[PDB]
């Protein structure tokens, strides 16, 4: 949709809103089939070399056969591997062969009751048996050598990808599945029209989240399984949280306390809850659409958003980390940059036509991308994203100023607001209890 | 062999046994040689274009020339790079050329006393000198153009691969080493017959654990070093540990304490000790065989297994982490799934033909893969592995219930049973001394 950003000066955090979900929640498994042939002058020597390459590919394929620690562990290709085992049962390959005899695309019901889409993408049995067997040994035209090289290339390329990936490839390349084949596969999938438009317009994201699993060679048939993403939760509001360390600004080195919100990442509305994605590789952004894998996700109540408006709210306990290392850095957000400037570091913001526009004082600040192209923090230069959008600065007193440094716990990696206050309970009690006894 | 799994309810952990070891403990370096030439109508125009591509490739190659923090740091290609320096000494290249004059494979003794297998995989010197120099300018047949393209293509593919990898590639592709060449290298390696069968039947794993190091172009010979894995510890028992957070189930949001075993990973018996592999990328599982790199491993006493049958045993101190973040997740094991369900999260297990067959209550539980295809934890759906095997559920009272929440240390990232217990000692003593004083 339309992207907006809100920076919170109290907690040195920014939220960018206006995004839309495409959440991978399930898998669809399809069987891709290549039909093979069983084979028992300079142009003849060229065909012999290409035939040996084809036979070696068949033999080579036969011989083959902050908060990320809170996530669970899944098996990404379990659904595809399960279908591969089903294909090893007696008669399963024959059923797929009989279904694809007169057509290149069919829906086949397996023994376990699952119906899968079957595609025959390459027919090397027909070309070798019909256009290459009667002639072969006197070749009269160089055309058949080149035409055989063109046909056999895809098989060799597929074998090359499987042999260097131990039979499991991701992303799914165009040798495994062409754009025409993938779009045809999407149009016949048991999904809604909304899912079909989302996949057809974003096939490059679909490829990046799909798997190709080499399965079996049996009865002159090569088969591999393409595991395609199912985007079950779509077009729901999503927002990204950016956080930077918030420290005190005492001139003496080593005398400053710091805290950082550790819940940075992608958040998506999902039924009546929120999907949280702490890691950055797990989510792909295509224009306004955020493609996040639910496998690398945490399910949280909708009250997690209360930390952005009030870090001290009683409904939700906001995750923080504390330290005494006040180093300078910058976080590039969707529509601006958060600058954390501490110590003697020089922090500035510039644009290409006018030079330095802003010089940052010690602390944590923010600039929009409207008049800024670059941010310099010490020795590193950052380019800001030039995406269109509206930014809002929300003034507030940094919450690091509410803490007494003498009793501040500054060695917490995975703490929260309540946990930090719990340690402040106890430390103040020791001085309070001892004073009464003394 | 036969895979079995045992789930322990007390510590919320599962062990899958029955695996067999293939541990990479060493390296073997081999030298792979391509002979080059010293060279310099529409058909002649095509030959000149291919010849320029060969010369540019030569010029381009000449211009080129939880517990993972406890691991050590190695140099993976140190052995291969050391051989490369040896080949730069005077007379070393000529020795390899002389040994490969009448044969494509030989064992060559270097200056430093090391013997290495040397392989000539491409001979572009003879083709260019004999089949292409005399005809050089009237070409009468298109066959020589196509035949030249096929021979020079492998050199171009090797150059392209080395150019985007700074001269070091992993995995080793079939352009650097074909399947027939790699099997030939394995058969001549100074290894036992058992090692030869293991490498020959798992060449795809061998490729993923080998390096190709561009070495030298000198005196019309191109040489690169392929560093092959040496699997010295073979066929010993291996097992995998899966752990999940174990929390109390009080209805108040932030009143619960959690602990998780942090020693998840692979374990293999090794000459009276145990090799522990905390990380997941470091170990590749091909059927029943586990291919683990000893570089990313710790050596532990055999008593580390005592933590699986008794986490409170005095012989070994089991590593744990504690917190107050009771989030829901699932861990997919070899033969089932561990489900940690906390708060208001909905957790179910189901199969495709019958629907939801189990609803999880609060706590952490386990389900086998015999009647289960999928597991849902909140908004996340997990497919379970469908591998055949026997699962055992070991009933036991969760050990999180043995801890007094008032004195529980709930901020330990790399603790152990003793460290947690020793911290409980101090807090309990502090109130005990004060009570006695009062």
């Amino acid at each position, epitope marked *: 949709q339309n992207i907006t950003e809100e920076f919170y000066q109290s907690t040195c955090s920014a939220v960018s809103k206006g995004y839309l979900s495409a959440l991978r929640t399930g898998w669809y498994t399809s069987v891709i089939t290549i039909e093979l042939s069983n084979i028992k002058d300079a142009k003849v020597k060229l065909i012999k070399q290409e035939l040996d390459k084809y036979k070696n590919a068949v033999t080579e394929l036969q011989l083959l056969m902050f908060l990320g620690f809170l996530l669970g562990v899944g098996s990404a290709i379990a659904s595809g591997v399960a279908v591969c085992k089903v294909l090893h049962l007696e008669g399963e390959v024959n059923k797929i062969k009989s279904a694809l005899l007169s057509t290149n695309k069919a829906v086949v019901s397996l023994s376990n009751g699952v119906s899968v889409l079957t595609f025959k993408v390459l027919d090397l049995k027909n070309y070798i048996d019909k256009q290459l067997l009667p002639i072969l040994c006197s070749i009269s035209n160089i055309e058949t050598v080149i035409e055989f090289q063109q046909k056999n290339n895809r098989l060799l390329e597929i074998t090359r990808e499987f042999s260097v990936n131990a039979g499991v490839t991701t992303p799914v390349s165009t040798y495994m599945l062409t754009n025409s084949e993938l779009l045809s596969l999407i149009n016949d999938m*048991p999904i809604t029209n*909304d*899912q079909k438009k989302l996949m057809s317009n974003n096939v490059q994201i679909v490829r990046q989240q799909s798997y190709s699993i080499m399965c079996i060679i049996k009865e002159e048939v090569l088969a591999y399984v393409v595991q395609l993403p199912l985007y*079950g939760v*779509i*077009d729901t509001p999503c927002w990204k949280l950016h956080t930077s360390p918030l420290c005190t600004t005492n001139t003496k080195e080593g005398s400053n306390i710091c805290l950082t919100r550790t819940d940075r990442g992608w958040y998506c*509305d999902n039924a009546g809850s929120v999907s949280f994605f702490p890691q950055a590789e797990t989510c792909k952004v295509q224009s306004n659409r955020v493609f996040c894998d639910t496998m690398n996700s945490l399910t949280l109540p909708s009250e997690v958003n209360l930390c952005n408006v009030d870090i001290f709210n009683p409904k939700y306990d906001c995750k923080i980390m504390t330290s005494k290392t006040d180093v300078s850095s910058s976080v590039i957000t969707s529509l601006g940059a958060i600058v954390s400037c501490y110590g003697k570091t020089k922090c500035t913001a510039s644009n290409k036509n006018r030079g330095i526009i802003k010089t940052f004082s010690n602390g944590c600040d923010y600039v929009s991308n409207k008049g800024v192209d670059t941010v310099s923090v010490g020795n590193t230069l950052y380019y800001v994203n030039k995406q269109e959008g509206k930014s809002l600065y929300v003034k507030g007193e940094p919450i690091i100023n509410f803490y007494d440094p003498l009793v501040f716990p500054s060695d917490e990696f995975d703490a929260s607001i309540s946990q930090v206050n719990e340690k402040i309970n106890q430390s103040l009690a020791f001085i309070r209890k001892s004073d009464e006894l003394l | 062999q036969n895979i079995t799994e045992e789930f322990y309810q007390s510590t919320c952990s599962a062990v899958s046994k029955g695996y067999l070891s293939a541990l990479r403990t060493g390296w073997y370096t081999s030298v792979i040689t391509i002979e080059l030439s010293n060279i310099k109508d529409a058909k002649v125009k095509l030959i000149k274009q291919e010849l320029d591509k060969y010369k540019n490739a030569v010029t381009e190659l000449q211009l080129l020339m939880f517990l993972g923090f406890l691991l050590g740091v190695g140099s993976a290609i140190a052995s291969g790079v050391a051989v490369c320096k040896v080949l730069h000494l005077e007379g070393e290249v000529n020795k390899i050329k002389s040994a490969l004059l009448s044969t494509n494979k030989a064992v060559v003794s270097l200056s430093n006393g090391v013997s290495v297998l040397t392989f000539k995989v491409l001979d572009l010197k003879n083709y260019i000198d004999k089949q292409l120099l005399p005809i050089l300018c009237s070409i009468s047949n298109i066959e020589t153009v196509i035949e030249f393209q096929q021979k020079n293509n492998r050199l171009l593919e090797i150059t392209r691969e080395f150019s985007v990898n700074a001269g070091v590639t992993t995995p080793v592709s079939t352009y650097m080493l074909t399947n027939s060449e790699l099997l030939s290298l394995i058969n001549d390696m100074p290894i036992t017959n058992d090692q030869k069968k293991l490498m020959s039947n798992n060449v795809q794993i061998v490729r993923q654990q080998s390096y190709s190091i561009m070495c030298i172009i000198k005196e019309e010979v191109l040489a690169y070093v392929v560093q092959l894995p040496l699997y010295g510890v073979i066929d010993t028992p291996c097992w995998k540990l899966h752990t999940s957070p174990l929390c109390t189930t009080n209805t108040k949001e932030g009143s619960n304490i959690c602990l998780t075993r942090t020693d998840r990973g692979w374990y293999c018996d090794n000459a009276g000790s145990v090799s522990f592999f905390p990380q997941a990328e470091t170990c590749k599982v091909q059927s029943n065989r586990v291919f683990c790199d000893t570089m990313n491993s710790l050596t532990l006493p055999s008593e580390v297994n005592l933590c699986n049958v008794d986490i409170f045993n005095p012989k070994y101190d089991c590593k744990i982490m504690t917190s107050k973040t009771d989030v829901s997740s699932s861990v997919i094991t070899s033969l089932g799934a561990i489900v940690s369900c906390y708060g208001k999260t909905k957790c179910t297990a189901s199969n495709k033909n019958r629907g*939801i067959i189990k609803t999880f209550s609060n706590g952490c539980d386990y389900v086998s893969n015999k009647g289960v295809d999928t597991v849902s934890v909140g908004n996340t759906l997990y497919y379970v592995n469908k591998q055949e095997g026997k699962s055992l559920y070991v009933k036991g009272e969760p050990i999180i219930n043995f801890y007094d929440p008032l004195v529980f240390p709930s901020d330990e990232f790399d603790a152990s049973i003793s460290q947690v217990n020793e911290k409980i000692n101090q807090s309990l003593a502090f109130i005990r001394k004060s009570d006695e004083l009062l």
Partner: antibody
Amino acid sequence: EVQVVESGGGLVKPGGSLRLSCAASGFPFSSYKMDWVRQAPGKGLEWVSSISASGSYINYADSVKGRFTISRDNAKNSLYLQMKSLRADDTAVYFCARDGGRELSPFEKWGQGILVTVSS
Amino acid sequence: QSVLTQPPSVSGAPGQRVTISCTGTNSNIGTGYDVHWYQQLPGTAPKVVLFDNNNRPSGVPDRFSGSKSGTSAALAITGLQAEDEAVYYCQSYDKSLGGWVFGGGTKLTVL
């Protein structure tokens, strides 16, 4: 408790127009796809139209395509149908329905339904 | 054909098990879409009693089972009760219609 209600349906002449309004109260309206389902008196259910959670995706049955236009306002938690060029075949009780928040889930939240009558 | 075929009426004595069939085509069930089941009283809105061919919503008694096989689906009600007297609808997603196809409806009479 979800309170999904409809309003704005009555008696129109053939070729006339109506605008149905459906207002939701007790759930995160912006995270659900909304539908219209109609039931002619004495017959079964017929799916009319759908709109995704943020309005990107809109679908119509062929029987109402080119004459009905679904819309929503997430600020007001409202659904609209905006019927035009109505015929006698359009007489039915119209339900606005909410699914389970995922793509192929069943309708689990229904309005009470409002009757639309087209006659001369 | 964007059509689901359902028996017009089913009757059963109290305490017996009745079955309601839902026959689909290659556009809806032959494609691989699941079947959901709805129970509607004469004056009220439909209420879902089964989804994903066998999954029971909260508050639905275990008497409703359901199953899918091939291109047809069935809904079974063991131990028929007077409260089960309603019209039952099966629906599926249909790829040709580009939306939801509902069944004709089966009036279940408790004798």
